[PDB]
Curated annotation (Swiss-Prot):
SUPFAM superfamilies: Cyclin-like. It holds the Pfam family Herp-Cyclin. Keywords: Cell cycle, Cell division, Cyclin, Host-virus interaction, Modulation of host cell cycle by viral cyclin-like protein, Modulation of host cell cycle by virus. The lineage of its organism: Viruses, Duplodnaviria, Heunggongvirae, Peploviricota, Herviviricetes. Disulfide bonds: none annotated. It comes from Saimiriine herpesvirus 2 (strain 11) (SaHV-2). InterPro entries: Cyclin, Cyclin-like_dom, Cyclin-like_sf, Cyclin_dom_herpesvir, Cyclin_herpesvir, Cyclin_N, Cyclins_cyclin-box. Belongs to the cyclin family. Cyclin D subfamily. This is Cyclin homolog. May be highly relevant to the process of cellular transformation and rapid T-cell proliferation effected by HVS during latent infections of T-cells in susceptible hosts. One of its GO terms (biological process) is symbiont-mediated perturbation of host cell cycle progression. The keyword Protease does not apply.
Length: 229
């Protein structure tokens, strides 16, 4: 049972309470734009499901201390995606494969120097429990057999990764955000009803609080207007 560890180092997550408070120019709404962009970027590269959720973590951290400009959010957000693939995936995309695949959007040298700034700003500790980390772990704990895991991990991740674009979920336990996204998925594709609302209520401990997350995850997911970027 790796849920206890998860719940523990999940408490080691900075309770923002102020998504980008230090930001002058850029605001919470420049975040929704940038994350939609980063999401598209991570999808265009078919990177691990953990790369996007991890870059979001990096991003909201970096920008919780240093300052960003509307004109550099893509550099910053691109660097976050680089930093993230470099730590999770086995074959961590290079600054090169990231400049050419996105058609010299920035010079191979600018990301280099942007990545570094972020690593420095974050004191070289880029690591985070991502809602993504709860799918498999809560899948069995939810009495769900390894026959529907492969398809449940795809939709649940797609939901979560799309939901994390919203500044709502950006104030939740990665655990909860993984429950509501795991639920909103089993909902749309029902093989069994949703009695798991109680079953999960013991893992992440909560019952009326584990519902609101669902209403927020699913509400946030239904908010992916690629037409905002």
């Amino acid at each position: 049972r790796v849920l206890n560890n998860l719940k523990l180092r999940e408490l080691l997550l900075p309770k923002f309470t102020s998504l980008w408070e230090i930001q002058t120019e850029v605001t919470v709404d420049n975040r929704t734009i940038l994350l939609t962009w980063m999401h598209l970027l991570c999808e265009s590269f078919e990177l691990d499901k953990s790369v996007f959720p991890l870059s979001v973590s990096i991003l909201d951290r970096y920008l919780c201390k240093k300052q960003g400009t509307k004109k550099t959010l893509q550099k910053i957000g691109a660097a976050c995606v680089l930093i993230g693939s470099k730590i999770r995936t086995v074959k961590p995309m290079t600054v090169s494969k990231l400049t050419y695949l996105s058609c010299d959007c920035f010079t191979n040298l600018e990301l280099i120097n942007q990545e570094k700034d972020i690593l420095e700003a974050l004191k070289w500790d880029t690591e985070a429990v991502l809602a993504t980390d709860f799918l498999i772990p809560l899948c069995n704990a939810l009495k769900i057999p390894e026959d529907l895991w492969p398809q449940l991990y795809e939709a649940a991740s797609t939901t979560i990764c799309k939901a994390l674009i919203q500044p709502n979920i950006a104030l939740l336990s990665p655990g909860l955000i993984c429950a509501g996204g795991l639920l909103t998925t089993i909902e749309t594709d029902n093989t069994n009803c949703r009695p798991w609302t109680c079953y999960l209520e013991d893992l992440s401990s909560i019952l009326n609080f584990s519902t609101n997350t669902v209403r927020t995850v699913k509400d946030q997911v239904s908010e992916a207007f690629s037409l905002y970027d």
